[PDB]
Amino acid sequence: LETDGINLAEVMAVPGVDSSRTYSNSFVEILSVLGIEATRSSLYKEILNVIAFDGSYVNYRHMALLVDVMTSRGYLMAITRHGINRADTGALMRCSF
Amino acid sequence: NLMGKRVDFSARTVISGDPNLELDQVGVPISIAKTLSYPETVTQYNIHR
Amino acid sequence: EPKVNIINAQDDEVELMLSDVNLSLANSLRRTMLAEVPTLAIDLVEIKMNTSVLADEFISHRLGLIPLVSEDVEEMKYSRDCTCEDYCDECSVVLELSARHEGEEGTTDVYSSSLIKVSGPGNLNVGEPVRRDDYDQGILLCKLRNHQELNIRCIAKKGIAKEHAKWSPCSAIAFEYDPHNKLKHTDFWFEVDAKKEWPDSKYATWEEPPKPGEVFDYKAKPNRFYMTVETTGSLKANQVFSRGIKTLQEKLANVLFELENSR
Amino acid sequence: REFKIFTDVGRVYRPLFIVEDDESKDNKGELRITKEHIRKIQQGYDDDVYGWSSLVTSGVIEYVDGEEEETIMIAMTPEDLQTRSLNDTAKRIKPEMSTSSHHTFTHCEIHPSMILGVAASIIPFPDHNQSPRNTYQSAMGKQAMGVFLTNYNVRMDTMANILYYPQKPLAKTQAMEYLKFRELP
Amino acid sequence: MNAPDRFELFILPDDVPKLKITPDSRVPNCIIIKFEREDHTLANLLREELALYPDVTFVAYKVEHPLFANFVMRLQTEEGTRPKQALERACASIINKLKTLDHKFNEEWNIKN
Amino acid sequence: LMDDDPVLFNRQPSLHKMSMMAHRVKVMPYSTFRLNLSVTSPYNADFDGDEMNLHVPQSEETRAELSQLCAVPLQIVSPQSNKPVMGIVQDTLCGVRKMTLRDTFIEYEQVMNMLFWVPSWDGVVPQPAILKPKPLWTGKQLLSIAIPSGIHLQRTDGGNSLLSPKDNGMLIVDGKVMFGVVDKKTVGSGGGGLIHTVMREKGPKICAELFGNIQKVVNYWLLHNGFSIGIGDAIADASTMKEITHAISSAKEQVQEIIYKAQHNELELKPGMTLRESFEGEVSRTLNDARDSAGRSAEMNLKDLNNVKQMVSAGSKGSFINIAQMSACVGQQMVEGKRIAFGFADRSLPHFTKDDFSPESKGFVENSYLRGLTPQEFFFHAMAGREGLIDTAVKTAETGYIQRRLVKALEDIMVHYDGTTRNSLGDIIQFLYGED
Amino acid sequence: VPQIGDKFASRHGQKGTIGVTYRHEDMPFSAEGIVPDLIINPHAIPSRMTVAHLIECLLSKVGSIRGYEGDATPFTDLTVDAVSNLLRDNGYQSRGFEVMYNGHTGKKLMAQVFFGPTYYQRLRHMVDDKIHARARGPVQVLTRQPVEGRSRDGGLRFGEMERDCMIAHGAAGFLKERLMEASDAFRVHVCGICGLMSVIANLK
Amino acid sequence: MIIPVRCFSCGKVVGDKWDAYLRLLEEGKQEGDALDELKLKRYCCRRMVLTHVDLIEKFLRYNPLE
Amino acid sequence: SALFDDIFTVQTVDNGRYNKVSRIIGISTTNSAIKLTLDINNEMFPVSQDDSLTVTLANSLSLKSWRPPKPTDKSLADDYDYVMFGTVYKFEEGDEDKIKVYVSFGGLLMCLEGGYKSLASLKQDNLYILIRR
Amino acid sequence: QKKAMSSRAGVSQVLNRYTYSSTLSHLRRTNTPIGRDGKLAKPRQLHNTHW
RNA sequence: CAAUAGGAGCUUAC
Ligand SMILES: [Mg+2]
Ligand SMILES: [Zn+2]
Ligand SMILES: [Zn+2]
Ligand SMILES: [Zn+2]
């Protein structure tokens, strides 16, 4: 099955569904439902899909690093000023960005 | 001025292709080769040159 | 063993078949006649008064491109091997051009025949701009209106076509061999049949076409070369050919000299 | 159910031939311009100055802006006004146009190459190129050394470039007769 | 502004030799000759002349860069023969062939009148 | 500035670490910069106006840093996709394809010149493949001379036997080619090819010299062979023209049938897709397959002496779509993912009738570039090319912004001596780099 | 005068710069002795699909042989086949190929060469208007950094992406040297107690 | 501007033929026949004379300023 | 002084793919099941169907830097019409008595089947092939 | 003059006299003052009504 | 032994 829209928790419960394999393309939902490691897995899957769509191949470690930086704090850290500049790093780095 | 800045000892001109150059070789115009410079400390192995 | 068969021979062009020589020899001769046969051409221009619409370096380029009679240029010296300072009489030819339009209607054309030889290493027959006939007007140089004037002192010197094209005695050296592709040195592009789609060489009737029963020969080298030398009037065709041969001979003699005197 | 007449300033417009469309005469369906009009244009006068404006005022060419263009059916060439009865593997297939039983044309292009501008008009055979290359030439042809004016010697500008020996092109477009590219190559 | 002079193709400096010979030690009885201020005209002539001798085992030339007017030639010969003597022999042979060619052209041109 | 000085050489934009590399200097006249042609790929450069910057290191520490970290030989393999980024390109590829064909033979004098042209030749003349009645070398021998010894490569292309009837696949034993045309699949920038093998076995210096050896040999052979392209290389014979036009007419009939089915309400919709979107998707499928089939016909018609076919087969420029558009059919133009929209009221151009959904009305170009486009096809193709130019002009800003943000997010992340991957705060991002 | 690095184009988007120049005797020639002014690479036609370039070369050849100007107006009934028929009627290979010889050796080329006249343009971008080098020169008053401009003898910007590439390379010393010793390096005195640059220094 | 002395491609002298070419054009002869009689046989030489545009006539019309 | 002498009857010749190169198939006239596939230069040694070729494989031509042969010296190749040099790149000691040898003559390929007792001595580094008629 | 901001720029330009066709094109040029502040690619597109 | 700044406009290569 494929669907439009997202309700992961209720569909995982419906009898007849493989509750151990339901997946969502919205990793914020994954984080709210399945935790942070499953969020990392989903994030890697999405990034691999976006890159390998056209037959491009990026080595694993680069996308692994990108998803590990985005999930290191326990929650999703966006690649924006609202994400990068809310860290505890020095003031000069944050101002330089 | 801090993340990026203008620098001395640089050059710019149109590039051309040369089948007879090695892979790690670049052909430098004579005028640029004379305008740019490298500071070489004088030692007892390079004093004649 | 080398042989020459002249097919057409006039003053400006000679068409000849060369045979029993290597292709390298024939191509070296073509290259020598195109590039290394000395001639005479204006290499220094002095403007006194130029009030024409054309620019000074425009006129200088055109004057440098004017063919001059160079029959005796080989008895002359290169201006870099003479002890003299600013041009003397033996390594240069000095020309004058004076032109002027008087009146307020019409245009006065300045032609290459108006160039006048003043000095030069007499009695050598060098320097004069080449005229096709007795009634030739020569090359167009400039045009003049009311009160416009041109006063120029040109110097002519000896040089070769390697340094600059204005010293080239030749225009086009047509050159070909093996009209029937017996040696299979080319491989004809075609759509349906390579024999119908390709025009015959102008020397096709000079050689027997291959027989259908014939097999390919792997011993045959190129042996007959059909070439047509043309000149610009500065030198004659036989003169261009003979001096190209002589220039090649002296280049080889120079190599031999350096080899022997390197021992 | 609207009728809009515009006399505004600043509207862009272009001329077209007028195909006779009144469905009452044998002259229906073909161009109103004939060989007398071309004879008059070459002559330079009517047989009791005859130029473009006389064609416009005689009702054989009219101007249309983009809005009016919505309502018209423009034939691409004067031959498209009649269906032909060919099989030429070299000449390009003029489109079939089979869906429509009977065409009622109202206008014809004077010449299809006129859709191009000044810079694109220099290009020879622009219909054999992919469009980005035509765009690059339209940009690059403006940077080409020539003779901008014949009085460049009595003018004093910051910079000027004049080609020594300009040559007209061996392959030329009809538009360049009007662009003076053969007079100032 | 960076263009060298068009006469450095042919004018030999005083500090630059016309010809310089070094030996190729990898194979026996071989030499490397650099001709300064020459081009394909002399190189191809000499190469195709030398390539037809029985005692010449290797002969080749190249112009490493078109913007520099020289070529380098590798020539190997058999045990008894020296590549230098074969080089003089080839030069002399081409000179003689050109002299015969010139004589025949002049006689033919006179006959054509 | 003198010969062999290391200088940093750079072209903007500098999208990756191999856009700015250190080169050795060779002084030359004629005020342009000179580049070997295999390094133009990492710079994304060509020679139609480009300019590049040169930075001179002013100390010995920076000279050593440039020569031991940024040098061109050290960047041949990239970490982006663990494959080489420098390959054989753009004429050496076509020439090596022509040279390593099975029926390419070379006489002794040209062989001698090619051997002397190889900078790393050891002075040993290889035995000719044929000894009688006339010594002949094959192009594979002369190319194998370029390859260093101790290299073994083996590739299978569509299950070829060891006798290779098509001369496909690849076998290299001790640096000698046994069979297989040498093309993009062997000397390109793909992974597992010859360049990657030589890089991994011999080091960066020998792999760098391989580029020069192959370039010089192939360039000499192509100089004395020649390679051209003309108007005749885009022309297919009459029977192929009949086949192509028949295929296009059949596809036009198929589209007309789809239109009839849609208009009398009998078309079968698809999930998550509207009836109009289903109609458009089916028509687009049909026309794309029409163009592909006409292109296949044109490609089969091309002889082995066709120059476009040689360039495509070498993989040095062009592809099957280029052949198709030049000789058979330009095909369908797309603006914003759809066919040509009804910019006028219910039509694409004012030369069409209302509500005409035929392929010609909505942006199908039936002609080829050789045959010439009609004014309508010309305008539609102009719209499509304009869309492409706008896309290229407009997406680059979003891409540059994205890459700047990624760099700022990841700029402070380094692998430490204990194996961990930490940021400037010392926080762990990965306990082991790459997990391996 | 044109030289290496000057930019030229034909009227079909085929721009390029001069890579090298060859003399009359070095260039390939046809059997009639005609040599080209210009040799472009075949690899610019296929992926760019500039068929009009080849068609215009063919038409120009025919026009120059028959002594008129070819009409290349778009959307006319002219075809390549008619042009090839004219060219063949003039005694030339109908597709514009010619048997040419190698200038270096005079040997025939194994392949035939597409040959003929084409209208080229001299673009305003000359290398001599672009070549710039700077060792040391004027600096800005405010920032004391190299000025901006080729005409002003300025320096080149070592922007942020160049810094990213140097960081990827791990060349820390080179980056410090670009940003300090090749640019506005300065010396200031700080207070060991307050850490402000409020130190009054009299070095003499 | 004014007729070039030489042919660019090969170097034949064409600068002495512009007036003859114009005279040939006055009596009605078409361009190819005129180029044939002047013995311009290679299409490089032919396009040298056939494509020349004589701009010096236009430049000469502005009064000399001396 | 030869490794494998034999006479073959040419079965098929596919000129086909190339212009100077043709692939031939031939079974021995005296010992069938010995198959020979061979690429040959057409212009140097043209071959037609049903022709009979004396094919020799040798490890030398005597009775490392190639030099042109003189007229005065002699070698094994003097008695043949078509001589090629190649590299053995696969020796298939395979099924019961199917033995396949692969030789590459500068990209012109050869395969030779037959019983082990015929091709046992064909396990070398480089092989010459010589042909008559 | 004192309201240079909020006024249209580039309405007048230095006539391009590099070559004749460049002058002829500059005299026939058009400019939509949409501005580059905004990535709407729609007004940059060649449109059917442009014919 | 010392060659302003700020703006706007048109362009070059991606
Ligand atoms: Mg570029
Ligand atoms: Zn003197
Ligand atoms: Zn303090
Ligand atoms: Zn000419």
Side-chain angles (χ1 to χ4, degrees), chain C residues 11 32 34 38 45 59 66 69 71 75 79 110-111 146 153 170-171 212 226 236 239 250:
Chain C
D11 268 346
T32 288
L34 286 158
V45 185
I59 302 298
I66 286 178
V69 160
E71 293 179 354
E75 304 96 26
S79 199
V110 187
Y111 287 103
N146 54 77
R153 189 186 271 102
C170 284
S171 47
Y226 309 101
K236 285 179 170 168
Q239 300 190 316
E250 298 300 18

Side-chain angles (χ1 to χ4, degrees), chain A residues 44-63:
Chain A
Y44 178 81
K45 183 179 162 60
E46 315 283 326
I47 292 164
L48 180 65
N49 174 247
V50 184
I51 283 168
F53 165 72
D54 62 358
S56 306
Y57 160 82
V58 174
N59 187 218
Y60 169 79
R61 58 210 62 239
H62 306 307
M63 320 196 281

Side-chain angles (χ1 to χ4, degrees), chain F residues 11 46 48-50:
Chain F
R11 190 184 165 266
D46 47 11
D48 60 3
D50 286 293

Side-chain angles (χ1 to χ4, degrees), chain B residues 1-47:
Chain B
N1 300 107
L2 285 164
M3 294 295 101
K5 50 176 77 151
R6 302 199 169 271
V7 292
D8 294 336
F9 293 104
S10 44
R12 176 170 168 112
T13 188
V14 169
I15 48 160
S16 280
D18 207 314
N20 279 290
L21 279 190
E22 182 65 26
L23 189 81
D24 59 357
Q25 274 183 327
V26 60
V28 181
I30 282 164
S31 86
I32 296 170
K34 267 149 57 199
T35 304
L36 299 174
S37 63
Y38 177 72
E40 186 156 344
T41 57
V42 185
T43 81
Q44 51 89 29
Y45 293 135
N46 72 280
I47 183 64

Side-chain angles (χ1 to χ4, degrees), chain F residues 15 391-406, chain G residues 161, chain J residues 39:
Chain F
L15 301 176
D391 278 352
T392 295
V394 159
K395 64 90 173 173
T396 198
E398 291 286 79
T399 300
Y401 190 35
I402 280 165
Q403 186 253 1
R404 177 170 195 260
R405 303 207 327 263
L406 280 160
Chain G
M161 312 208 293
Chain J
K39 286 205 165 223

Side-chain angles (χ1 to χ4, degrees), chain H residues 7-12 42-46 48:
Chain H
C7 178
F8 296 144
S9 310
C10 68
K12 191 182 169 74
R42 295 180 295 283
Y43 50 79
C44 61
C45 300
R46 280 159 78 83
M48 277 309 283

Side-chain angles (χ1 to χ4, degrees), chain F residues 46-265:
Chain F
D46 47 11
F47 308 123
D48 60 3
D50 286 293
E51 292 159 80
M52 277 175 44
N53 312 281
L54 177 141
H55 299 275
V56 177
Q58 293 298 313
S59 296
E60 285 267 355
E61 300 76 0
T62 51
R63 271 175 74 107
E65 281 189 19
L66 289 182
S67 79
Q68 315 298 293
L69 292 172
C70 305
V72 174
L74 298 173
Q75 272 74 80
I76 287 166
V77 177
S78 181
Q80 190 272 331
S81 299
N82 64 300
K83 52 183 269 196
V85 286
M86 312 204 198
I88 289 298
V89 290
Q90 176 61 249
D91 282 330
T92 301
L93 191 56
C94 183
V96 71
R97 198 208 74 98
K98 294 161 72 68
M99 161 191 278
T100 50
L101 287 174
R102 198 175 256 145
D103 62 339
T104 294
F105 299 94
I106 311 165
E107 292 92 335
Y108 184 54
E109 293 179 290
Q110 190 162 345
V111 159
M112 291 183 71
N113 272 331
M114 319 185 97
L115 288 171
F116 193 41
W117 256 113
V118 192
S120 65
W121 182 52
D122 63 313
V124 172
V125 182
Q127 184 177 2
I130 311 176
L131 282 296
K132 208 171 177 182
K134 173 180 181 181
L136 293 179
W137 288 256
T138 77
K140 284 175 174 78
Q141 280 173 287
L142 274 297
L143 177 84
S144 311
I145 291 287
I147 307 171
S149 68
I151 298 308
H152 314 282
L153 188 70
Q154 179 177 2
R155 191 183 75 249
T156 293
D157 316 315
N160 64 337
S161 62
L162 283 184
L163 203 81
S164 198
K166 301 277 179 166
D167 205 19
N168 52 356
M170 188 65 217
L171 180 58
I172 287 177
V173 192
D174 195 359
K176 295 188 167 225
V177 183
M178 302 288 129
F179 58 89
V181 297
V182 177
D183 47 359
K184 197 169 167 190
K185 294 185 209 73
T186 308
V187 289
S189 45
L194 177 67
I195 291 157
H196 207 172
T197 312
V198 179
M199 183 61 204
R200 294 308 300 128
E201 293 206 328
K202 300 295 172 166
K205 179 174 174 90
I206 285 154
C207 190
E209 282 153 347
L210 175 87
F211 289 86
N213 297 344
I214 298 184
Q215 274 166 17
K216 284 171 179 93
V217 184
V218 176
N219 284 348
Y220 180 89
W221 181 93
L222 195 66
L223 166 62
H224 293 292
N225 194 76
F227 181 71
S228 193
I229 184 183
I231 193 56
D233 286 308
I235 304 190
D237 63 344
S239 88
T240 312
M241 273 306 307
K242 299 298 293 295
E243 280 163 30
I244 279 160
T245 188
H246 171 264
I248 282 154
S249 290
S250 301
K252 278 153 84 174
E253 211 71 2
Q254 283 177 355
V255 168
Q256 190 178 6
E257 294 180 45
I258 297 155
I259 291 171
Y260 177 100
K261 268 181 42 57
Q263 293 179 356
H264 295 55
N265 189 272

Side-chain angles (χ1 to χ4, degrees), chain E residues 69-84:
Chain E
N70 47 350
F71 70 91
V72 61
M73 152 170 293
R74 186 182 205 250
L75 174 84
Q76 194 190 11
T77 52
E78 296 173 357
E79 292 56 70
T81 187
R82 307 167 48 218
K84 181 213 184 296

